C-alpha cells in the first residue's frame, strides 16, 4: 500500500500531514500546542511562529521531528 502525503506521528506523539503541514507560513498546530502546554514555554511558541516563514525545510523538519 502506502500513500503521499503521509500522516506522520513522531516519537513524542506529534501529528501532522507530511509534507504539506510543513510547507506553510505557520508551523503545524500540534507543535505550537506542544510548546505551550507540554513544555509550558509560550516564549518558544511565539519565537517559532516568528522564525517559521524564514526557516528552511530542513530546519522545519528538524523541529517537527524532535519537538
Amino acid at each position, epitope marked *: 500500500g502506502g500513500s503521499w502525503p503521509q500522516r506522520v506521528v513522531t516519537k*513524542k506523539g506529534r501529528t501532522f500531514l507530511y509534507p504539506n503541514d510543513l510547507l506553510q507560513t505557520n508551523p503545524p498546530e500540534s507543535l505550537i500546542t506542544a510548546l505551550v502546554e507540554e*513544555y509550558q*514555554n509560550p*516564549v*518558544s511558541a511565539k*519565537e*517559532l511562529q*516568528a*522564525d517559521w516563514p*524564514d*526557516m*528552511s525545510f*530542513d*530546519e522545519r523538519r*528538524h*523541529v517537527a521531528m*524532535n*519537538l
Partner: nanobody, 116 residues
C-alpha cells in the same frame, strides 16, 4: 541546513591555553543557547560551558574560573578560551546549538579532540 563546524582543538601541555571555535551554519534562530560538552574516555558526557543569546553563561564544576565563553552572533559563532589546562581536561569536546535553548532541538558537532 544546520552544520556545526568545530576547530581549534589539539594538544597543549599542562598549564597551556587553547581556543575552541564553533561556527553554526544555516538558520540563525532568534534565540538559542550555544556551548560545549566533553566526553573523557570511558566516562559520562559532561557539560563544559554554555551561553545563551541573552548572554548568560553556565559552567561545569571543574571549570573553576579557568574558561571564558564568548559569542559573536553576527557570524553566529562561539569561542571557548581555555587556560591553565591539566591532564584531567583531556577529552573529546563537542559543540552544540539549542534552538530556543531547548535540548530536544539540539544539533551536535562531530567533536574535536583536546589533549594535555
Amino acid at each position: 541546513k544546520v552544520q556545526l563546524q568545530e576547530s581549534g582543538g589539539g594538544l597543549v601541555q599542562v598549564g597551556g591555553s587553547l581556543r575552541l571555535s564553533c561556527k553554526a551554519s544555516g538558520f540563525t534562530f532568534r534565540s538559542s543557547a550555544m556551548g560545549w560538552y566533553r566526553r573523557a574516555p570511558g566516562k559520562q558526557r559532561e557539560l563544559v560551558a554554555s551561553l545563551t543569546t541573552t548572554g548568560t553563561a553556565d559552567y561545569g564544576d571543574f571549570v573553576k574560573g579557568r574558561f571564558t565563553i564568548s559569542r559573536d552572533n553576527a557570524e553566529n559563532t562561539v569561542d571557548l578560551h581555555m587556560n591553565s589546562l591539566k591532564p584531567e581536561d583531556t577529552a573529546v569536546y563537542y559543540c552544540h546549538e539549542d534552538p530556543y535553548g531547548m535540548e530536544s532541538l539540539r544539533y551536535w558537532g562531530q567533536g574535536t579532540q583536546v589533549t594535555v
